[PDB]
Design a protein around this ligand. Structure first.
Ligand SMILES: O=c1cc(S)n([C@@H]2O[C@H](COP(=O)(O)O)[C@@H](O)[C@H]2O)c(=O)[nH]1
Ligand SMILES: O=c1cc(S)n([C@@H]2O[C@H](COP(=O)(O)O)[C@@H](O)[C@H]2O)c(=O)[nH]1
Lengths: 255, 255
């Protein structure tokens, strides 16, 4: 097992992964903020205040009531100032021909500002090939959704394995997974795990939570994705710090 | 085995499904146009010219370069004038809490204009319960993706069986399936099938094509979804009419 810093230098490491792993080591953070807010000012205030505490900001641009490309320009400024990657949680899940247009075009022009995007493997490897035709020239990466956090999730067994194969066979664009645990034994791949809170529980629509120690420590993932655990707290800064120190120590102790 | 017009009056039928089934019978069409274009002017001219030939217009609003809600206003006017439903092919595929916001909010406000949307079942039934919270009040319907047309699709076997099961358990909101064939023996559910062209072929990003006669006649689906077989043709009206008459005769011969 290697540190984030050593993993950033692996021969087969993707540039976007390497960038990520370098700033994770530098800033002592393996926390991805899930900025699930509907107003751009909120988004930008959270990105500014929490920037120093996070390795990555996961967006859902399609829930932003006042999206504009300028909001994303301002977000990029914050990402560069504070050193975090931008991850648009689009869950591409269509045929290659359709996802290609969805990633490059429309109002959102997701490929123009997102270091990372993600995709479901359900359509087969066409979904990755289609995204790649846009992502590769723009030097972007992709995460494949190998497991989900929600109750009744079908991303289990052979579906999970099928996700792992697809990532391994498309390593020039695929940099890792959204998963509940380590699913690949190859150190070049990132594992990012949502459905994380300090306290036990869930929501009224199928979400289930596990702690950072569980996820990073016992299950061997690299990075926690946390939304309401931070966003609903009163002091979002202290809450981010708490999650960061939780995920970081879990990591060091596993090392 | 009942005609569309008869199925429209089935006891357990959804009001949206009943509206569709009636206009299908009346207009002699079981063709859904996949309006896969990036210009609002092109979308609206296709919707006006092809409107009399189609039971439904399927959108990917996220590829429209000049989307405004006004554009959707104008599409609704045409949908009412010519009698077809509007189907946003968003493929919701996240936790219940996330998809509820993606459906209702953001720039697109999908729920405000789409009669129908679809969802992947991989998250478990929470994806449907989240969408339902917005859609049921708005008298909308949802399609569950039971099978995909693309090479390497993982929507098979127990995955497909789980989709049918989730459909049958949320029948107050779910009106049917995106599938390759008939997957449910209950006639209140609609079966819509993509990957349809008159000629043999595919694309270079994993799409696979079958004929209206195959998909409606042998495999027993209700409605063909057709993109490029119409859109890339010179005469899009003549193309639509060819696909309509193929799908309608296919259905007539089954009954
Ligand atoms: O399996 C998943 C995958 C993701 S990316 N997510 C996302 O992580 C975030 C979880 O938010 P939380 O429950 O508020 O922490 C949401 O944006 C989800 O859409 C998830 O909840 N389950
Ligand atoms: O399994 C599917 C499901 C859908 S909805 N579709 C959609 O139908 C259309 C197929 O278009 P064509 O290949 O140009 O006919 C695209 O918009 C796809 O997103 C598909 O191709 N395969």
């Amino acid at each position: 097992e290697l540190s984030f810093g050593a993993r950033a230098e692996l021969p087969r490491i993707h540039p976007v992964a390497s960038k990520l792993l370098r700033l994770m080591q530098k800033k002592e953070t393996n926390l991805c903020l899930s900025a699930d807010v509907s107003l751009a000012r909120e988004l930008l205030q959270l990105a500014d205040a929490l920037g120093p505490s996070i390795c990555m900001l996961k967006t859902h641009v399609d829930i932003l009531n006042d999206f504009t490309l300028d909001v994303m320009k301002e977000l990029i400024t914050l990402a560069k100032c504070h050193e975090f990657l931008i991850f648009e949680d689009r869950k591409f899940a269509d045929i290659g021909n359709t996802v290609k247009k969805q990633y490059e075009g429309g109002i959102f022009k997701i490929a123009s500002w997102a270091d990372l995007v993600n995709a479901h493997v359900v359509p087969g490897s066409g979904v990755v090939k289609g995204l790649q035709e846009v992502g590769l020239p723009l030097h972007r990466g992709c995460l494949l959704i190998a497991e989900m956090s929600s109750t009744g999730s079908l991303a289990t067994g052979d579906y999970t394995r099928a996700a792992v194969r697809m990532a391994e066979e498309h390593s020039e664009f695929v940099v890792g997974f959204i998963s509940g645990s380590r699913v690949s034994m190859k150190p070049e791949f990132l594992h990012l795990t949502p459905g994380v809170q300090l306290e036990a529980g869930g929501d009224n629509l199928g979400q289930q939570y596990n702690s950072p120690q569980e996820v990073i420590g016992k299950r061997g993932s690299d990075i926690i994705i946390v939304g309401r655990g931070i966003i609903s707290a009163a002091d979002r800064l202290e809450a981010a710090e708490m999650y960061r120190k939780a995920a970081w120590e879990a990591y060091l102790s596993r090392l």
